[PDB]
Amino acid sequence: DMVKEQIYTIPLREVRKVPAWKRANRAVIEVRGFLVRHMKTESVQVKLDKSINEHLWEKGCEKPPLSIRVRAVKFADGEVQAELAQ
RNA sequence: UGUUCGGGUCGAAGCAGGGCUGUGAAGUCCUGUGGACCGUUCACAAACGAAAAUCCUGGUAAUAGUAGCAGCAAAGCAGG
Ligand SMILES: [Mg+2]
């Protein structure tokens, strides 16, 4: 069950260095890598709620937000449930 | 091919590498492989000897893990 519950505020400023239309994929990869290194788990262990995917693709694939605030959960079996914090 | 004398499953031809002979074309022997045919005297024949033809046919290098997999319609991400 609950072993590590904390709210994060992932910055996405390095995402804005790739070409314009490839920014959303890079945003997804960046969020996943942030959670991987701040939760100490393998890459596959990380799961993303559809709210995060909705938020990153709100304004097309060229204008991802410059920040995002998530609320992740860690379980003993390994999985991490990241869902969009308010 | 005609003729004389022979060899071979106790291992013929062929192939790889060596020893000796000959100025040389080449001959003969030894070792490994191979599994069925091959020589020699005297003569006679020829669809008879290749390193080259921007030669012919087949096999195979370097170039090289290289060019290309962009240009006219830049399309995908999350969960299951
Ligand atoms: Mg030739």
UniProtKB/Swiss-Prot annotation:
GO BP, one annotated term: cytoplasmic translation
UniProt keywords, alphabetically: Ribonucleoprotein, Ribosomal protein
UniProt name for this protein: Large ribosomal subunit protein eL31
Gene3D superfamilies per UniProt: 3.10.440.10
UniProt xrefs under InterPro entries: Ribosomal_eL31 (IPR000054), Ribosomal_eL31_CS (IPR020052), Ribosomal_eL31_dom_sf (IPR023621)
PANTHER family hit by this protein: 60S RIBOSOMAL PROTEIN L31
Keyword Transferase: no
Organism: Methanosarcina acetivorans (strain ATCC 35395 / DSM 2834 / JCM 12185 / C2A)
SUPFAM superfamilies assigned: Ribosomal protein L31e
Gene this chain is encoded by: rpl31e
Sequence similarity: Belongs to the eukaryotic ribosomal protein eL31 family.
UniProt xrefs under SMART domains: Ribosomal_L31e
Cited Pfam families: Ribosomal_L31e
GO-annotated molecular function: structural constituent of ribosome
An example Gene Ontology CC term for this record: cytosolic large ribosomal subunit
